[PDB]
């Protein structure tokens, strides 16, 4: 049953990814975040290593839930008869980057440092578990307030990584690369690239670099606060119009504004607490 399992609290909010409520585990009082995602709403179904027929959410999360990483981790599932349920982790106390960003302001770079190379590492465990996440932003990374440390959500726009051309996308259009605008192709890594980019420059200044499609294929890169020279040209190079000229996801940490990163507990206590 799922009622007697969990005890369901107030919702914490709700969208595309379905609707989100805080619960606790009775077993042992785990604090739980408990997804309702209607039927109705799924358009891509896998199936699991046994061939039950489940949302690819559900497939992409049990593929990347193993072991500890920087993922916000599946614990159960269940299904009804219009809807998936799915038990996820809930960190306490909890903010979005994009109500951080919102709430802050731009990040001091030293803070920044610290959370993008946190999602670096996170994506890094997807792609090595065969899961392309495909909406890699500011609203789908939690932060863990007293722990320091930043957690990946929302696999619902996500695929299988492959190395072939995908033609099919429904993340984030202005995360979405120029390559996607104009051509409606794009490949897994070198997208998930522009998409760090702009979530870097976002970061650093405040909000997003491009609103419209025409200044996506631009990729002209206007930077309105102060920004280290060194910042900027990591953010330049994952925002290549070519996707051949952006970093791989190795030149991105090797990259001279990325190194002597803070660990995640003492950016919390500089940053955080």
């Given at each position: 049953?799922?009622?007697?399992?969990?005890?369901?609290?107030?919702?914490?909010?709700?969208?595309?990814?379905?609707?989100?409520?805080?619960?606790?585990?009775?077993?042992?009082?785990?604090?739980v975040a408990?997804?309702?995602?209607?039927?109705d709403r799924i358009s891509d179904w896998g199936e699991l290593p046994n061939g039950t027929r489940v949302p690819m959410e559900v497939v992409l999360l049990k593929?990347?839930?193993?072991?500890?990483?920087?993922?916000?981790?599946?614990?159960?599932?269940?299904?009804?008869?219009?809807?998936?349920?799915?038990?996820?982790?809930?960190?306490?106390?909890?903010?979005?980057?994009?109500?951080?960003?919102?709430?802050?302001?731009?990040?001091?770079?030293?803070?920044?440092?610290?959370?993008?190379?946190?999602?670096?590492?996170?994506?890094?465990?997807?792609?090595?578990?065969?899961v392309l996440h495909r909406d890699i932003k500011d609203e789908n990374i939690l932060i863990d307030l007293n722990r320091g440390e930043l957690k990946l959500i929302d696999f619902g726009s996500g695929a299988l990584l492959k190395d072939t051309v995908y033609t099919d996308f429904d993340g984030t259009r202005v995360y979405s690369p120029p390559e996607w605008?104009?051509?409606?192709?794009?490949?897994g890594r070198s997208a998930a690239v522009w998409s760090l980019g702009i979530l870097l420059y976002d970061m650093v200044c405040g909000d997003i670099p491009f609103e419209h499609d025409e200044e996506i294929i631009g990729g002209q890169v206007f930077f309105r606060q102060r920004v280290s020279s060194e910042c900027q040209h990591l953010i330049r190079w994952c925002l290549a119009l070519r996707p051949s000229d952006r970093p791989t996801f190795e030149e991105i940490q090797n990259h001279p504004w990325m190194?002597?990163?803070?660990?995640?507990?003492?950016?919390?206590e500089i940053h955080l607490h």
């Amino acid at each position: 049953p799922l009622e007697s399992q969990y005890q369901v609290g107030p919702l914490l909010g709700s969208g595309g990814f379905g609707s989100v409520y805080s619960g606790i585990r009775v077993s042992d009082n785990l604090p739980v975040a408990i997804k309702h995602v209607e039927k109705d709403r799924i358009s891509d179904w896998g199936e699991l290593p046994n061939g039950t027929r489940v949302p690819m959410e559900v497939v992409l999360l049990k593929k990347v839930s193993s072991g500890f990483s920087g993922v916000i981790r599946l614990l159960d599932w269940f299904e009804r008869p219009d809807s998936f349920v799915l038990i996820l982790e809930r960190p306490e106390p909890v903010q979005d980057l994009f109500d951080f960003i919102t709430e802050r302001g731009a990040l001091q770079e030293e803070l920044a440092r610290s959370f993008f190379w946190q999602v670096l590492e996170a994506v890094r465990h997807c792609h090595n578990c065969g899961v392309l996440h495909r909406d890699i932003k500011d609203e789908n990374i939690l932060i863990d307030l007293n722990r320091g440390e930043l957690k990946l959500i929302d696999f619902g726009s996500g695929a299988l990584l492959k190395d072939t051309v995908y033609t099919d996308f429904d993340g984030t259009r202005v995360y979405s690369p120029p390559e996607w605008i104009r051509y409606h192709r794009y490949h897994g890594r070198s997208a998930a690239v522009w998409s760090l980019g702009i979530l870097l420059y976002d970061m650093v200044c405040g909000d997003i670099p491009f609103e419209h499609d025409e200044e996506i294929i631009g990729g002209q890169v206007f930077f309105r606060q102060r920004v280290s020279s060194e910042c900027q040209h990591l953010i330049r190079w994952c925002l290549a119009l070519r996707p051949s000229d952006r970093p791989t996801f190795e030149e991105i940490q090797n990259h001279p504004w990325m190194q002597d990163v803070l660990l995640p507990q003492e950016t919390a206590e500089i940053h955080l607490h």
